[PDB]
Every structure is written in C-alpha cells, then in structure tokens.
A and B are shown apart, each in its own frame.
Chain A
Amino acid sequence: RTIETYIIYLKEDLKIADTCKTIKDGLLKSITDKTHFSEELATYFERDNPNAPFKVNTTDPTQVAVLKKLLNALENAEKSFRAIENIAVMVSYKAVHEIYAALQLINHSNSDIQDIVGPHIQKLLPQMALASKALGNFAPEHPEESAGAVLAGVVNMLPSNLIFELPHYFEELQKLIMIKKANETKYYFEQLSSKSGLLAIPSYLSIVKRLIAHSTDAYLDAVAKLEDIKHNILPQLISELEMVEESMGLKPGLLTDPALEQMNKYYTQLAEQVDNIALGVLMDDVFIQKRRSNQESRLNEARLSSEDKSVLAAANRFFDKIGSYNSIHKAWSKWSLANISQSEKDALIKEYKQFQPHFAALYPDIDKLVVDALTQPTGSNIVSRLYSSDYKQLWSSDHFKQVLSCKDSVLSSIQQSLAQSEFKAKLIEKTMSHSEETAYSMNNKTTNLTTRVQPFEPLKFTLEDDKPVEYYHKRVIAASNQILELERAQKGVAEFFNYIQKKYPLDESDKEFLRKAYKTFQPQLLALKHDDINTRLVSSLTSSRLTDLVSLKSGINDYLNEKISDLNQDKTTLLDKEEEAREEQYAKNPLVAKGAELEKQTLFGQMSKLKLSKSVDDFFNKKFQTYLKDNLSPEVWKQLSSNGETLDFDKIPYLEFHKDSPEVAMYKQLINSMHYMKNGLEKLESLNDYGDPNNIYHRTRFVMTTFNALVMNICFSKYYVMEAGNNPGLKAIVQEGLDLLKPLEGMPLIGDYLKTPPKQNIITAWKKQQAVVESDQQLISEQLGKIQEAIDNFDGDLEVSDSAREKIKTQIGEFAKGISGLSFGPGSVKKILAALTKLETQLSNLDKESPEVTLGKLKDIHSELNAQFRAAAEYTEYHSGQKFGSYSNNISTIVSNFCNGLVSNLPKDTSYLQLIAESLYQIPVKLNEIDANVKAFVEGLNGLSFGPGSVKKILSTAAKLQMQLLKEIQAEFGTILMAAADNAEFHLGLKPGTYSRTVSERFEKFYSIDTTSTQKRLAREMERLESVKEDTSAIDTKKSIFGTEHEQFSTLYQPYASLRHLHAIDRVFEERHKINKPSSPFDKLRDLYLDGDFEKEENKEQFLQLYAELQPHLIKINYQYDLAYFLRELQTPEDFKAATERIINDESKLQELITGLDDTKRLKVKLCEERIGYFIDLLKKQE
C-alpha cells in the first residue's frame, strides 16, 4: 500500500523519470549544439547507438569526462525510475544516490563545468530532495532527528547574458557620442558599473572605468589615449573574452565576434569624431600582434602542460614502490607507512610531493594519512597528536592497501588533466585560425604592407645560476612563442614560393595572396641584410623583378631552420633547468596535508566560508525584533513577546497557527521562516567547515542528501519570507533579509530552486484523483501518434529536417498533455477524430498540393479543431462544476499554439497608481524622465488596495484634473492615499501613523487644510470601529460547522457511539433518525460514521459532500486536509472509515479555531480603540 503510494508519487507528482529524461536531452542537445559549443567538445559525445552509455577513457579531457559521467548518471537514473514506473524502494534509493554522486562530481568541478551544467541540473534538485524525503518515510521514525520546516505544499512550487552584455555596453558607449555630456556619462556609469554576476573576467571594472574616463574627453595626448585604448585595454578585454570561451569550450568566436563588431563600431566612430575635432582601424597591425601573442602564450602553456610527464612518472613510481611490499614486508612494517625505513620514506616523500594535488583532490583523507605517516617523527606518540576518532579509524587500517586502492583514480585524473591541456591547446589553435579569418574578413579581405616593421631578433640566451621556477618558465614560454613565430614564417615562405612556382613557371593580378604570404615572414627576411629587397618588394606589390627573389629562398629556409633548432635546443635546456629548480623548491618545502584546503573550495565550502548564518542571526536578533517592537502595536506584540522587548525564543518554532489572528499567525510564520533559514544556513556552514587540523574529511556521495535537504528547507523558508514581504508595512525589513541572502542566488547547486488553483466539484476531484491512482484518451493519443508518424514518414520533395521532426513531436506531446484533461460530449469525439484524420491526410499530402492550398486547408483544420475543442472544454467545465471561461480559454490557447508551431516548423491597483502618476506628471508639463519617475513612484508604493469606493473618487478627481487642464486635487489624492494607508496599517498589527506618514512623505516628495483631512481620517476610523463591532465571523463559522444542536446531538450521540462498540440492537439504529436528525455537517458526519456501511457508493458520495463542506475550516487546523492528496488516498471503504475517524477526532481543534476567531475580533476592537485614541490625540494637539 505504502509502496504503491510512493510509486504513484514518483510517477505523477514528482515525475522524476520524465524530469531526468528532459534534463539529459536538454544537456546533450546544448553540448552538441555546434552553434554554441565547438566541434571538438561535440565529437566526444557522438554515439553509434543512443542506447549505449558514454565511455570515459583516460584520454578525454577532465570536463568531457565529468560531462560524460553526469550524462550517464542521468540516463541510469531515468532507466531505474522508468523501471519503477513499469511495475522498488532499493532501486529508487540507488537511482537517487547516483544522481547525488553526479551532483558531488559537479560540486568538486570548476566554474566552467558548473555554469555549463547548472541551468539544466537545477530542475531536479527539488525533485531529488522530495524523493529523498519520501524515501525517508521507509526508515524507522526518528523524532527530532531533523525537526526542520514542515513542507506543506512544496510539490506546487516544483519548477546568454555574457554574449549580450558587452555588445550592449559598447552600444551604450556608441550612444555616448557643453552640459549635455555631464549627466549621460554618470547615467551610463550607474547603469553598467552596477551590473555584476558575469564578471568572470577578473578586471572588467577597470576596463569600464577606463573607457568611461577616456570617452568623457594638443592632439598628441588624444592620439596617445586612443592608441592606449586600441592597444592596451581593448586587446586585453578581447583576450580575456577568448580565455572565457576557451575554458568554457564554446565555438571559436561565439561571444567575441559580436563584441568585436560592437567595439569596432565604437572605435571607428571615436576616430571619426576625433578627426572631425582636429589610424583608427582596431586591427591596424599591432592589435593583431598582441591578440596573437596572448593566444600563443596560452597555447604554449597548454602544450607544455600537456607534454609534461614528470607528474605521471612520479605517481607511477610512488604506486610501484607502495606495491612492492608483499605480505611479509607489510607485516614487518605492521601495515603502517610510518614503520618503513627512513630512506624509503624520503623516496616516497620525493615522489608524493609532485602529484599531491591530484591525490588530495580525489582523496583528502588518504592524503593526510600519507603526509602524517611519511613526515611525523617515529619518536612522537600518537596520543600527543590528538587525533580524532575517524582519523584513528583511517590510521589503524592497512596503509598500503588504502594507498594502493587510489592508484587507478589518481592515474586517470593525471592523464585526464594532460588530455584536458591538449584539448585546450586544440581549442586555442582553432581560436587563432578563426581570429585570423575574422581579421582578414573585417578589413577588406585585403592586407597591407609597410616598410618600417622592426626586424625579428631571436631572444638572447641567459642561464641564471639560481632563480625561482617562474623565471625559467617565463623564459621557456618566450622561447616557445618565438618558435611559433618562426614556424609561421617558414610556413608563409613555403606557401609564397609554392604559389610563385604554380602561378608563373612584379606586375601581376593576384598580388593579394603574395602580400598575405609575405607579411608572415617579412621580419625574418628583414633580419638578413635584405632591406633593399624588402623595400623593393613592398612598393612593387602595393603598386605593380620576381625572377631574382627566387634565388634567396634556400638562404631564408636554412636561416629559419637554424633559428628554430637553436630555440628548440634552448627551450629544452631551460626546461631542464626548470626541472632542477622545481626539484630544489620541492626539497625546501615540507610535506603538508592539502585535503582540507581543497575541500574548503568546492561549491558548498565557498558558500560556508561566507558565514551567512551569523549575519542572518544578527538581523534576526538585533534588527528584526527591534523593528517588530517599534512598529507593531503593543496588543499584537504581547502575543509574540512575553517579556516585552525580546521574542519568546523558548517557543520560536510555532506549530498551531490556528488560535491566532491572521496578522499574528503571519508574524509567527515569518519568525518561523527566519529561524529555519538561520538554522539551515548554520548547519550547512558547519557541515562544510573543514577547520579541524586533527580530523579527516572523507569525500563521499552520501553527504549530498543532507546538503540538498538543507538547501530545500532554506529556500522554502525564503519563499515564505518573500510571500509575507508583499505587504505594505513589511517591505523594508524583508527586503533587508533578502539582501542578506543575496549571495545564494548564483551558486549552481542552489539557484532560485523554487517557483519564486482551480475550484471544481468534490466528486469530480475525487474521481480525478482515483483515475490518477489507477494510471477517448487512448483514441486521441493514437490519432496524435498517427499524425506524428505520418509527418515523420514524409519523404516527398518537401524535405523535412530532423529538427522539424523533433519540433512536431514536442508539439504533439504538448497537445496530448493538453487534451488528456478533457471530456468530450456525444459525437464530439467523432468530429475531432475526423478533423485529426483530415489533418493527417493533409500532412501526408503536403507535397501533393500547392503551398497556398496547403496553408488554407491547414488553417481550416485549425479553426474547426479549435471550435470543437472550445465546445468540448465548455462541456467539461459544466460537467465538472468549474467556472465558465477558464478552462476553455486555456484549451483554445493550447490548440492555437500547437497549430502555430506546426505551421512554423513545416516548410489592478498598480495600473491605477501608474495612471495617477502619469496624470500628476502631465498636469504641470502641459501648463509650464517622466516614465522613469512614474515607474519609481509606482514601485515605491506597490501593494495598496484603494477599495471599491475610492476608485470612483480617484476617477472623478482625474476627470476634474483633465477638465481643469489648485491644491484641492492634490489634497484629494493625498487623503485617498492616507485612507489606503490606514486600511493597510489596520490589516497588519502596525502602530497607527507609521506607514501612513511614510506614504504621505513619499507622495509629497513626488508632488514637487490639514484639519479637514485629519477630521476625515478620524471619521474613517470611527466608522471602521463600528464596522468591526458589527462583525460576526466567529458566530457564522460556528453555525456553519455545527448549528444550534451540537450539544444536544453530542448528548444523544455518545450512547449510540458507546453501543456501536444483539438482534434488537439495530432496531434503535433504525429509530435514531426519528430522535437525532442531524442539521449540521459535523453531526451529519457523526451519523455517517455511526452507519458504518461504507461499501455503498451513496454514503461515499455523502462523505465527499460533507468533507467538501468542512474542508475550508479543516485546512486551517492541518495542511493534510487538502483536495488533492487527501482524496487521492480515499480508495477503499476502510480508507473512508479512517478519514471519517480522523476528521471526527479534530472537534477540539474546531473549537480552538472558533475561539481563535473570537479572540481575533477581541484583538481587532482593541486595535481600533487604540487607533481612534491616537487620531483624537493628534487632532486635539494640532490646533
């Protein structure tokens, strides 16, 4: 029974298998886009068959490997969940924790993978958390183990900036082209410098400030500033963008081509303006050289890191030496690495110092074990080191076995890092090719020469006796970049002479190719004594003997060969000296554990280091409760604080919420949300603080469940905080708490995490839930499948791409989902199936008719089907007891969207305030910016009611203002705002005056005798007190739940209930209706329980009607008395009996609810009396 409930909860509510399939398909389609990501990364995910798992080799990049593992985890989770739906607890647990293992892989990944994966993987985090919580109900009950927030209805809240920001910024600066240029610059600075959340380029603020300053402005200084912009700032920004798109893995030029075009326009218009006031190409010669030099530096670092084999060799030696101990040797060492000989320890330390980062990243605890075993002196005792219990557990184990079990993982990590470096090098190579293509295209597809370029001087060799590692590294990279320059020069001369040989076996026609080839090796030709030849070639190539330059080809080739050989020799020598310096620096430093430092940085360690719980507690204790005391009236504050100045912290997690006023209950809920938020943040920080130097931190997949549960609780409490924050008097402090939690939006594994209600008949809802449990619809599904297969089988002249096939299949799925919730009348299903058959016949004959006839026929089909679906939806609405015009409009919208898709892929008081602000702004401007001021005024005063009566007054005042276009209109607007403010204040428990004076101040600030306004507000308050005195909600609810016979029915019903628990015993049961006739839903339910014959459907329907009557009151006592999940569990008559008993046993809580309503009226009358006292005091004092 419970397992069936769990299965249905997975299949229907969470829809975990469908979510996993959608996430996997979206991630795979995005990473194989070929328009957002490059082909190198895309080809790693090409599969022979879609049923085979991706294979993670040792030769694929780290990010490709982690993406493959994540995709495989998603596929296996979907497979397991689908297998569960095809029929359990163990399989669901395993699938959930496989997803959690993938999440842990993401946690330990870098920023690039995290941002690639986060948008897709954020869709199932709440689903995973709810699945884990449902699984937890199969474990033994553990009260107080969690004690977190009560997740009432979280199932309801189940849910390109980088490429556009720089173009938008440079468009804004293009727009910035006496006093006019004095506020526009400040406006742009405020608009752009305030923007954040995408500054992965860790300098962007410097660039934006520098461009603003330089665009604010003899001509030599201006030219110097222009050249500095063109050569120092803009190339640096372009290079940083290229590094972003290289680490990302995107296609060459994805987010650097639009930005480049934008800044090209910006710099060209700057140059034009400067020329007008008194060169500018952005790719003249040296921008290209600097871009290429940065690209080559990155490429050479990548190639050096890829070709390095010292770390892998050291790891191999370490694991070979560890594996050289047989059983006898290990027994002699007592299976501890600390008991081996000192020379062996020195060798192991030398090996481990070179690959410690990988080992510590994968195994942060075995790293500590190794470091302590190898480096701690043997004289020292274990007890004096103060090890923790689990560290001692790791210490007592076979050290050799533990270290050897990490061999495959560590070696795979090292080889995958090398493969990642090589893959990045390939990415950079394609980046340079694409940059060359774009630079060629941007100017004219033509290149220009100049006989003034400095010659190519090979770097001088200098072998410093002893310098830090970075010094030799810089020299090595300089040598490698020079090698690459010479290599390009030799390729250029080869192509130059090949084209010369093949074009004329110097007054030629195709001089562009010769120019582009000679510009590659001009410095090298200039290095030799060939200035005359170069100056003769440049002019003869830009304006016009080639038979003589062919002579000095072997000389140039041998010079390039000799210089590249020398640079290769020197790079090898400096690499050897780098190895020596690295060995010396490793020898100097001691061996120190690195596991905790890496664990502190993953994703949750970074969040934990923010210590947001401390700030949340500070706000909760120092700023929140003091504001509550200051602004809440003493009557409502006495409920929250027994002492008068501090909250009742001994009872913060309130659990009743039904014995209080709506304002008191809302305040208690807000306090509960703040408390849960603080506790969750502090628990997440404690579980991710790694500051114990005598402890080990094991990397496992089974901690992610706790992290996800804590994140879910935090986000649910924050949801309720913003929900309670949409009140006029509570916006400030709630916004302050939101600003405190601001550094939680942006983290990939939390994100928004949440969303950030029809009324149908009770019998209809119960039948729908029963149908959901037990799961024309088959007919329409088959018809849609036939349509889809007819579209897919279209092999006519009108070729249809597979993308259009996917689009039509998705549209068919959406249409099936939309129509699965419709009931069709007699003959309506025949009409809709005939229309669908005609549609599929037309689709099978798309190429058999002209496009005009095809579009006309499909439009007619769309119209007919939409009309039939409106008729069916209206019939369903009438038969389901819903409200007309709600479901039919949605059905028509779905049908219209589906038809538009197929035709495309086949070849409010807020408005009142807005108009008030617009009229008030247009009044003086027509009798003597506007949109921004109106928007600010509306935003600052969002959340007012205006009532049904003041709407007419506002309309009349606006009409009078229009007719007249002095302070009477202003006074009327002010008093209407004040009345709305009093309404808002009395709705809360606020002290009189506060929000009203705040809104009055805002209104008068936006604007740029009081006795009557004060008297009017006093009359408003007096009539409010009278209306509150006239309220009888408590009596009404009491009578509705049980009439004026509850006591009598109880008295004559207790003996019957006692007798219920022999032949003539039923006789009185027959006569009980002659003396105990019910008149109230609760007494009717009591009689229904006394009947006890729940097999019949008549009293089942009667119970459904009674529960429909009693639900609006039962929902306040408990959240489980809903109309979706409570009815879903009513399947057997025993379930009906159990539900009847459950509702029966809450009579004391209905009494508590009605007493709470009475106390609500009692508090309200005191609020009005205090208010009127305050206004009469203000009126008498003001004179």
Chain B
Amino acid sequence: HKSKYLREAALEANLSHPETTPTMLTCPIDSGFLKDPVITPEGFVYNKSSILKWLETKKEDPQSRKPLTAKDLQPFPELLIIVNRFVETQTNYEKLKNRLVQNARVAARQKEYTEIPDIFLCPISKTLIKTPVITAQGKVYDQEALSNFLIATGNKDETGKKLSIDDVVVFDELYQQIKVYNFYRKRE
C-alpha cells in the first residue's frame, strides 16, 4: 500500500491545480509540508514531530485508529521524493505567477494604450478579460469565454487537451489587476 499511497497522491496533485496544495500531502496534524514524515504498517502520512505529540494523548493511529506505538512509526522519506518535485513544480508555477502579475501591474499604469495589452486579452476570445481564469500549465482565459468554448467543442481546447472547468480556477491577483486597469481607464 506504500506505493499506492504515493501513486494516488501523485494523481491527485496532477489533476488538481498546483496552487491548490492537497490537504493530504501536508501532514494533517500540523498542516505543514512534508519534511519529516512517518509511516504505519498499512501506510499513512504524518510527521514525527507531530506523531510524538499525538501518541502521548492516544497511543494509536490518528486516522485508522489502530493501536500503534512510537517504535513502529519510523521516519518514511520515500514520500519526500515526490513532494519536492511537486513543490518545485508549484514553485515553477509560482515562478510564472508573480511575473504574470508584475508586468500586469505595469500594464495597469500605462496610459494611452494603442490596443488592449496582451496579458489583458483572452486568446480564445480576443476581448478584454472580464474575469481571469488560469490553467494548470500557466495560461489565462476568461471564465465564460472558456466555459462556452469547452461546451462547444466538448471540454477540449487548443491541441485537444483534456481540460475542464473544475480543473481550472479563477486567477485572483490578475482579477485585481484587471480591476485596477478598469478603474484607471474609467478615470477619463
């Protein structure tokens, strides 16, 4: 079950947006990233620094509730090897996020634009973005302009990738940047 746990954690992280950190990847006891995880005979993710406090009150499994001791609950770094890549992917994802916002901030203060800035233009709508939504790979569309497009061509897009509404969530920072741009243009 040790391999199945990481297998399904990997699929859950992959299907979900990388900015949505899974609640199981982080240790439920301390709500922190995997840095010192432990294992159970069936196989669950915890933290040693948290398991030592948990076992004092209840000498059993936090989730399966089976009677378990501290001797068996040994550090399990096999769950770390995935986490790092995930987080670096997250970091790499974030490595775009800030930039995708930073230039936007500058774009929010430019005056007398010849055309709507590209970061403010939806590629699948060719119009100003009303509410921005960000793909798992790092592209931004409009919420309605993506929903109607997906239902028109059957949850497919661009190169026929399996992308749906539930897997792509609103981009809040870009949304506030759009609000700033609209407020500044409305000043005229």
Seen from chain A, the residues whose Cβ lies within 8 Å of a Cβ on chain B are: 461-463, 529, 562, 566, 569, 573, 577
Cβ of B179 within 8 Å of any chain A Cβ, yes or no, is yes
14 A/B residue pairs, CB under 8 Å, sorted by A:
A461-B173, A461-B176, A462-B176, A463-B176, A463-B179, A463-B180, A463-B183, A529-B91, A562-B102, A566-B105, A569-B105, A569-B109, A573-B180, A577-B183
Contacts A463-B180, A566-B105 known; 9 new A-B pairs at CB < 8 A: A461-B176, A462-B176, A463-B183, A529-B91, A562-B102, A569-B105, A569-B109, A573-B180, A577-B183
Determine the chain A residues whose CB is within 8 A of the CB of B109 once the complex forms.
569
Smallest CB–CB gap between A1002 and chain B, Å?
69
Complex interface residues of chain B between 103 and 138 (CB less than 8 A to chain A): 105, 109
Smallest CB–CB gap between B31 and chain A, Å?
13
Query: How many B residues face the partner with a CB closer than 8 A?
Result: 9
Of all chain A residues, the one with the shortest Cβ separation from B98 is A562
Smallest CB–CB gap between B28 and chain A, Å?
20
Determine the chain A residues whose CB is within 8 A of the CB of B102 once the complex forms.
562
Of all chain A residues, the one with the shortest Cβ separation from B32 is A531
Determine the chain B residues whose CB is within 8 A of the CB of A566 once the complex forms.
105
Grouping DSSP codes into helix (H, G, I), strand (E, B) and loop, the B interface class, with mixed when no group exceeds half, is helix
Smallest CB–CB gap between B155 and chain A, Å?
32
Determine the chain B residues whose CB is within 8 A of the CB of A462 once the complex forms.
176
Smallest CB–CB gap between B25 and chain A, Å?
16
Smallest CB–CB gap between A864 and chain B, Å?
88
A573 to B91, CA, bound (A): 28
A300 to B179, CA, bound (A): 26
* B 172-188 to A, binary, CB cutoff 8 A, 1 in contact else 0: 01001001100100000
Determine the chain B residues whose CB is within 8 A of the CB of A562 once the complex forms.
102
A529 to B91, CA, bound (A): 10
A562 to B99, CA, bound (A): 11
A463 to B105, CA, bound (A): 14
Smallest CB–CB gap between B48 and chain A, Å?
15
Determine the chain A residues whose CB is within 8 A of the CB of B105 once the complex forms.
566, 569
Determine the chain A residues whose CB is within 8 A of the CB of B176 once the complex forms.
461-463
Q: For A462, A529, A573, A577, which residue has the most chain B Cβ atoms within 10 angstroms?
A: A573
Of all chain B residues, the one with the shortest Cβ separation from A531 is B35
A569 to B106, CA, bound (A): 9
Determine the chain B residues whose CB is within 8 A of the CB of A573 once the complex forms.
180
Closest 6 CB pairs of A and B: A463-B179, A461-B176, A463-B176, A569-B105, A573-B180, A463-B180
Smallest CB–CB gap between A1151 and chain B, Å?
94
Determine the chain A residues whose CB is within 8 A of the CB of B180 once the complex forms.
463, 573
Of all chain B residues, the one with the shortest Cβ separation from A464 is B179
A573 to B187, CA, bound (A): 13
Of all chain A residues, the one with the shortest Cβ separation from B177 is A461
A569 to B108, CA, bound (A): 10
Complex interface residues of chain B between 33 and 81 (CB less than 8 A to chain A): none
Of all chain B residues, the one with the shortest Cβ separation from A465 is B179
A221 to B65, CA, bound (A): 32
A747 to B105, CA, bound (A): 55
Of all chain A residues, the one with the shortest Cβ separation from B179 is A463
Smallest CB–CB gap between A888 and chain B, Å?
88
Determine the chain B residues whose CB is within 8 A of the CB of A463 once the complex forms.
176, 179-180, 183
Determine the chain A residues whose CB is within 8 A of the CB of B179 once the complex forms.
463
A573 to B176, CA, bound (A): 11
A461 to B181, CA, bound (A): 14
A573 to B183, CA, bound (A): 10
A529 to B105, CA, bound (A): 25
Smallest CB–CB gap between A630 and chain B, Å?
77
A176 to B90, CA, bound (A): 59
Smallest CB–CB gap between B172 and chain A, Å?
8
Smallest CB–CB gap between A552 and chain B, Å?
15
Q: For A461, A462, A577, which residue has the most chain B Cβ atoms within 10 angstroms?
A: A461
Determine the chain B residues whose CB is within 8 A of the CB of A577 once the complex forms.
183
A462 to B179, CA, bound (A): 9
A569 to B105, CA, bound (A): 8
A646 to B117, CA, bound (A): 91
* B 150-188 to A, binary, CB cutoff 8 A, 1 in contact else 0: 000000000000000000000001001001100100000
Determine the chain A residues whose CB is within 8 A of the CB of B91 once the complex forms.
529
Determine the chain B residues whose CB is within 8 A of the CB of A461 once the complex forms.
173, 176
Smallest CB–CB gap between A221 and chain B, Å?
22
Smallest CB–CB gap between B188 and chain A, Å?
13
Determine the chain A residues whose CB is within 8 A of the CB of B173 once the complex forms.
461
A461 to B180, CA, bound (A): 10
Determine the chain B residues whose CB is within 8 A of the CB of A529 once the complex forms.
91
Q: For B91, B109, B173, B176, which residue has the most chain A Cβ atoms within 10 angstroms?
A: B176
A291 to B2, CA, bound (A): 51
* B 74-96 to A, binary, CB cutoff 8 A, 1 in contact else 0: 00000000000000000100000
A1031 to B180, CA, bound (A): 101
Determine the chain B residues whose CB is within 8 A of the CB of A569 once the complex forms.
105, 109
Smallest CB–CB gap between A1073 and chain B, Å?
110
Smallest CB–CB gap between B173 and chain A, Å?
8
Of all chain B residues, the one with the shortest Cβ separation from A462 is B176
A263 to B2, CA, bound (A): 59
Smallest CB–CB gap between B180 and chain A, Å?
6
A566 to B108, CA, bound (A): 12
Smallest CB–CB gap between B181 and chain A, Å?
10
Of all chain B residues, the one with the shortest Cβ separation from A532 is B35
Of all chain A residues, the one with the shortest Cβ separation from B88 is A529
Smallest CB–CB gap between A908 and chain B, Å?
77
A529 to B173, CA, bound (A): 22
A461 to B102, CA, bound (A): 13
Q: For B102, B109, B173, B180, which residue has the most chain A Cβ atoms within 10 angstroms?
A: B180
Smallest CB–CB gap between A165 and chain B, Å?
48
Of all chain A residues, the one with the shortest Cβ separation from B176 is A461
Smallest CB–CB gap between A650 and chain B, Å?
75
Smallest CB–CB gap between B112 and chain A, Å?
18
Smallest CB–CB gap between A31 and chain B, Å?
47
Determine the chain A residues whose CB is within 8 A of the CB of B183 once the complex forms.
463, 577
A6 to B107, CA, bound (A): 79
A577 to B109, CA, bound (A): 14
Smallest CB–CB gap between A559 and chain B, Å?
11
A132 to B179, CA, bound (A): 67
Of all chain A residues, the one with the shortest Cβ separation from B173 is A461
Smallest CB–CB gap between A527 and chain B, Å?
13
A577 to B186, CA, bound (A): 12
Smallest CB–CB gap between B84 and chain A, Å?
11
A462 to B109, CA, bound (A): 17
Smallest CB–CB gap between B141 and chain A, Å?
22
A44 to B76, CA, bound (A): 70
Of all chain B residues, the one with the shortest Cβ separation from A577 is B183
Of all chain A residues, the one with the shortest Cβ separation from B106 is A569
Of all chain B residues, the one with the shortest Cβ separation from A529 is B91
Of all chain B residues, the one with the shortest Cβ separation from A572 is B109
Smallest CB–CB gap between B46 and chain A, Å?
19
Smallest CB–CB gap between B16 and chain A, Å?
21
Of all chain A residues, the one with the shortest Cβ separation from B178 is A463
Smallest CB–CB gap between B102 and chain A, Å?
8
Of all chain B residues, the one with the shortest Cβ separation from A463 is B179
Smallest CB–CB gap between B70 and chain A, Å?
23
Of all chain A residues, the one with the shortest Cβ separation from B101 is A566
Smallest CB–CB gap between B53 and chain A, Å?
15
Smallest CB–CB gap between B77 and chain A, Å?
15
A395 to B123, CA, bound (A): 66
Smallest CB–CB gap between B30 and chain A, Å?
13
A667 to B23, CA, bound (A): 89
Smallest CB–CB gap between A373 and chain B, Å?
32
Smallest CB–CB gap between B130 and chain A, Å?
14
Smallest CB–CB gap between B101 and chain A, Å?
9
A463 to B180, CA, bound (A): 7
Smallest CB–CB gap between A530 and chain B, Å?
13
Smallest CB–CB gap between A466 and chain B, Å?
11
A461 to B109, CA, bound (A): 16
Smallest CB–CB gap between B86 and chain A, Å?
14
A562 to B105, CA, bound (A): 12
Smallest CB–CB gap between B89 and chain A, Å?
14
Smallest CB–CB gap between A269 and chain B, Å?
34
